[PDB]
Write a protein that holds these residues in place. Structure first.
Motif, mmCIF file in Angstrom:
data_model
loop_
_atom_site.group_PDB
_atom_site.id
_atom_site.type_symbol
_atom_site.label_atom_id
_atom_site.label_comp_id
_atom_site.label_asym_id
_atom_site.label_seq_id
_atom_site.Cartn_x
_atom_site.Cartn_y
_atom_site.Cartn_z
ATOM 1 N N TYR A 117 40.824 16.182 63.546
ATOM 2 C CA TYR A 117 41.651 17.684 63.542
ATOM 3 C C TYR A 117 40.402 18.603 63.973
ATOM 4 N N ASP B 276 48.029 28.159 69.265
ATOM 5 C CA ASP B 276 49.480 28.061 69.280
ATOM 6 C C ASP B 276 50.511 28.684 70.074
ATOM 7 N N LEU C 221 50.457 27.408 73.526
ATOM 8 C CA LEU C 221 51.209 26.339 73.617
ATOM 9 C C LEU C 221 52.520 26.543 73.742
ATOM 10 N N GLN D 25 42.923 23.318 78.160
ATOM 11 C CA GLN D 25 42.913 22.137 77.486
ATOM 12 C C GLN D 25 41.734 21.274 78.064
ATOM 13 N N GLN E 255 48.366 18.293 71.035
ATOM 14 C CA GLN E 255 49.002 19.564 70.486
ATOM 15 C C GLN E 255 50.509 19.161 70.126
ATOM 16 N N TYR F 17 51.784 18.134 62.847
ATOM 17 C CA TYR F 17 51.350 19.511 63.449
ATOM 18 C C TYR F 17 50.598 20.203 62.433
ATOM 19 N N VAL G 18 43.762 21.245 67.003
ATOM 20 C CA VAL G 18 44.215 20.080 67.844
ATOM 21 C C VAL G 18 43.904 18.786 67.375
#
Length: 272
Positions: free
Chosen positions: A33, A41, A44, A111, A167, A191, A196
């Motif tokens: 991670y 977040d 996203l 990203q 993600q 999660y 990520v």
């Protein structure tokens, strides 16, 4: 027996902290991670929200106009009618509106930027300079794939990427679909807020001369009794090298990658 997946802060790695642990993780695990890498977040959720909005409210004609004419073309939607998929690359994308395009272009860019930075750390940590330099290697041909699951089990596979960034949003019922092989066991990959997940792929293995593991992973579907509350999404960004990236065919076999072709060297294009 070491089946845990560590977490690192990108900023801290960039400051030269945890060098030995990061290097060992790469060699023995090839996943981790990652926090502090310029992903939120919130961003996203916004990208997710607008695609789900389209799934639910776009007309039939609007949906057809941004649907992949053939799935092999990895651009646009599939499954609009288990899952719907939205795919993007660096060009030739399909967008249902100007705002969608702005939101998803920016999400793709962040990203891609984060994937380049983590890959830059993978290369630095193993003393690797790719032929033609680090920068030209990381300015490549990525693919983003977003899947939404509203409302046969495949064998674990490694990715044909340098790195892959993942993600997700969780299931309300707690089900964890993503697992990897770590230390000889399957390990759940839930999660995690503001982090990520990063997989090293086979290209990381090859470009570094075998210093990085490309771990195998799979996505489970829920059983019958975990289907209520299993709605989820995932966002998978594959940092794939340029088509002409060149590797040693011998080293690839030696690393346990199925390569069908012959010769001293091949290109990524040849392989995929």
């Amino acid at each position: 027996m070491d089946t845990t997946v560590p977490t690192f802060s990108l900023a801290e790695l960039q400051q030269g902290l945890h060098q030995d642990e990061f290097r060992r993780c790469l060699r023995d695990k090839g996943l981790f991670y990652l926090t502090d890498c310029g992903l939120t977040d919130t961003e996203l959720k916004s990208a997710k929200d607008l695609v789900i909005d389209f799934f639910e409210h776009g007309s039939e004609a609007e949906k057809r106009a941004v649907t992949s004419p053939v799935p092999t073309m990895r651009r646009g939607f599939t499954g609009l009618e288990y899952s719907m998929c939205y795919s993007m690359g660096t060009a030739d994308n399909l967008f249902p509106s100007g705002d969608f395009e702005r939101i998803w272009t920016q999400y793709f860019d962040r990203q891609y930027t984060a994937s380049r930075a983590v890959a830059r750390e993978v290369l630095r940590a193993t003393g690797t300079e790719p032929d033609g330099g680090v920068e030209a290697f990381l300015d490549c041909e990525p693919l983003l794939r977003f899947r939404y699951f509203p409302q046969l089990r495949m064998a674990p596979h490694y990715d044909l990427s340098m790195v892959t960034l993942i993600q997700q949003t969780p299931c309300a019922n707690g089900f964890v679909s993503l697992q990897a092989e770590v230390g000889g066991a399957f390990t759940d990959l839930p999660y995690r807020p503001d982090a990520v997940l990063v997989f090293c792929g086979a290209i990381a293995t090859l470009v570094t001369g075998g210093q990085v593991k490309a771990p195998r992973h799979h996505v489970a579907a829920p059983r019958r009794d975990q289907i209520a509350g299993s709605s989820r999404t995932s966002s998978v960004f594959f940092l794939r090298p340029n088509a002409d990236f060149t590797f040693s065919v011998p080293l690839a076999r030696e690393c346990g990658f199925d390569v069908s072709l012959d010769g001293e060297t091949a290109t990524f294009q040849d392989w995929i």
